[PDB]
Design a binder for these strands. Structure first.
Lengths: 109, 63, 85, 50
RNA sequence: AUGUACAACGGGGUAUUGUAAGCAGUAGAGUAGCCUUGUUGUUACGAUCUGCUGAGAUUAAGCCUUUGUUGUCUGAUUUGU
RNA sequence: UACUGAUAACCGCAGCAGGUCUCCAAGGUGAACAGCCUCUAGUUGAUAGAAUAAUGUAGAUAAGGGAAGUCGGCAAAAUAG
RNA sequence: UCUAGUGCAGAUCUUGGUGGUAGUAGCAAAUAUUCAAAUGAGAACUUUGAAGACUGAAGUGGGGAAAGGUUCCACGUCAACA
RNA sequence: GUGGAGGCUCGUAGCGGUUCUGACGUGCAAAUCGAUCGUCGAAUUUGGGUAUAGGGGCGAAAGACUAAUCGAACCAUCUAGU
RNA sequence: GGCGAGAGACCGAUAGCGAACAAGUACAGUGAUGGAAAGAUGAAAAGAACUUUGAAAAGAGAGUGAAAAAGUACGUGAAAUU
């Protein structure tokens, strides 16, 4: 309903990928990020930025980073209204080192 | 849309391969209108298609 | 590998078309058709190949002259032309 | 093949002119018993044997 | 279904490995060059070494813990002596 | 006189891991058109998703012993330039 | 009254058709796919772009012989095939 | 020292096909897949053309091969053979 | 056998010529040779205007027709099986 918000989060791909085949680590990272956004925003429609896909596939398939710093943007929908008026846009935050950060809220500016 | 043959004509025109030719999606309607090598040449001229930055193989380590 | 791979090795025609029958039976290294007997004068037939005769005999074609033969016998092999009654 | 003979090419041309469907006005004519072509020939399925 | 609530993060603990990067050094096999000619003369190369450094990284995915941060907590179905 | 020349245009009942003559042939390692990596060129095709029980197939490791196993040291291991 | 190619449960019968098995076995070789956009009624696979990978010049490259025959190229187009 | 022979040898392609009596075994396949193996400059491998035809051929000989067919091919007929 | 005529205590579309139909056809095989299946709307296409749902195919209505329990998957329309 409400909450056209943005926020910044941190995610532990290591514990979400532990035990996983080396040809599926990165794809599972993608699916797990969609699941993360579903949890934290209750949305089903989740669009990931190609910047984020590259930041995941940077070190390859089986070199995915332990942690990631995300900028999620719960937004209103358009375009021949779907099941949900709201979706999520997942984007990266180019940080030098993504350790020691806690999550925050972010506004329109 | 479908731009296979456009990419192919461009490859042959410029003298590179399809793994080099670049077609911007934001002019897709124009490139699909384009059917002939003359039009492909016009498109390269106006920059809607670029040859490509060659992939590097360096020899510093070997030297 | 007497089967499948040898069928893969199989690509050179023993037989090609014949100019008397048009059936792809002309053995090149013998220079004979296996159906009509080309380049012999006679046509190849056998009375054990009854079906073959029936397949290659008179009436399976146009009979470009022979139908008119019986018409003409009926009219008595006449010369000339009509008279505009 | 590429290096071919004129007889082969002749038969091929004839085949190519055969390989197309019926005319629908023939489907329309009187006393017609034809619905479809059945001498139809496709390079993938059956070969000419020439 | 609004609480010694739950989660995601963060922090701390416990563990594993083995002393991170970067900077500096009158450490360094030796070798070139300099001129102020040396009275360690200095500049450049150079495996590696030493200090900052039992440091740094990883640490729950089926580890412990939380005075922190940010969120979430009324959708559907069925049932009767 | 186009085009394929083959894990889809040929033959194998087929869009079959089979078979079918040949020419050109970069850099590095290395003795080497060996194996590994890369450039030009080309592909990214083979039904997919979620779990990760037994059993399988393929691949690996295992203290101490060291062929006692077994028809038989089969297989694997060691050896290796 | 006459006359027969005259009566089927079978013949591993013939031809055609239909089932249970069973929505089952199974669709697993060839290292591997992902993000977004466009189209479209509809996209795991079509097209583009970006990324990650492979063949690694005795190659999944480029050209041919035999064979094949128009598969070549384009436009439309998805009932059947893939 | 030179030189660089060999039906020499190691070992690629290539030709083959030992063992696992492995996989598969209503398969990828009416003989394949993977590893392990043999040989690899010669009695080598091989395309095309050509000759040899059924009680006949060809055979570095297994009764092997002769169009998925061989201790005598395939087609039709004799033949509705007994 | 060929050409032309007439007839039947014959067969009646798994029968009768292999062939009642675009049958010695498609198709297979190197080749010799082999060798199918397949008839019927209705008297007459009058073969379904028009509306609506749907992306469309099709559906529901409408309507033609003596009959859609005749809708080119068309005479009737058995059984297995559903």
């Amino acid at each position: 309903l409400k909450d056209v918000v943005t926020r910044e989060y941190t995610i532990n791909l290591h514990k979400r990928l532990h035990g996983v085949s080396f040809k599926k680590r990165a794809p599972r990272a993608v699916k797990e990020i969609k699941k993360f956004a579903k949890l934290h925003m209750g949305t089903d429609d989740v669009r990931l930025a190609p910047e984020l896909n590259q930041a995941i596939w940077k070190r390859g398939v089986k070199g995915v980073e332990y942690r990631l710093r995300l900028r999620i943007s719960r937004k209103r929908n358009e375009e021949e209204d779907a099941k949900n008026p709201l979706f999520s846009y997942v984007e990266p935050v180019l940080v030098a080192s993504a350790k020691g950060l806690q999550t925050v809220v972010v506004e329109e500016d | 849309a479908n731009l296979r043959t456009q990419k192919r004509l461009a490859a042959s025109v410029v003298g590179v391969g399809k793994r080099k030719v670049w077609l911007d999606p934001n002019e897709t309607s124009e490139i699909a209108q384009a059917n002939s090598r003359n039009a492909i040449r016009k498109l390269v001229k106006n920059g809607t298609i670029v040859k490509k930055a060659v992939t590097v193989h360096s020899k510093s380590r070997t030297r | 590998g007497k089967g499948t791979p040898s069928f893969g090795k199989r690509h050179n025609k023993s037989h090609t078309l014949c100019n008397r029958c048009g059936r792809r039976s002309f053995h090149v290294q013998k220079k004979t058709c296996s159906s009509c007997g080309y380049p012999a004068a006679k046509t190849r037939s056998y009375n054990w190949g009854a079906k073959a005769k029936r397949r290659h005999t008179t009436g399976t074609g146009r009979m470009r002259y022979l139908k008119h033969v019986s018409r003409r016998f009926k009219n008595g092999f006449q010369t000339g032309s009509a008279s505009k009654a | 093949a590429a290096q071919k003979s004129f007889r082969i090419k002749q038969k091929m041309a004839k085949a190519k002119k055969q390989n197309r469907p019926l005319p629908q006005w023939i489907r329309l004519r009187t006393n017609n018993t034809i619905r479809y072509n059945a001498k139809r020939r496709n390079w993938r399925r059956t070969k000419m044997n020439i």
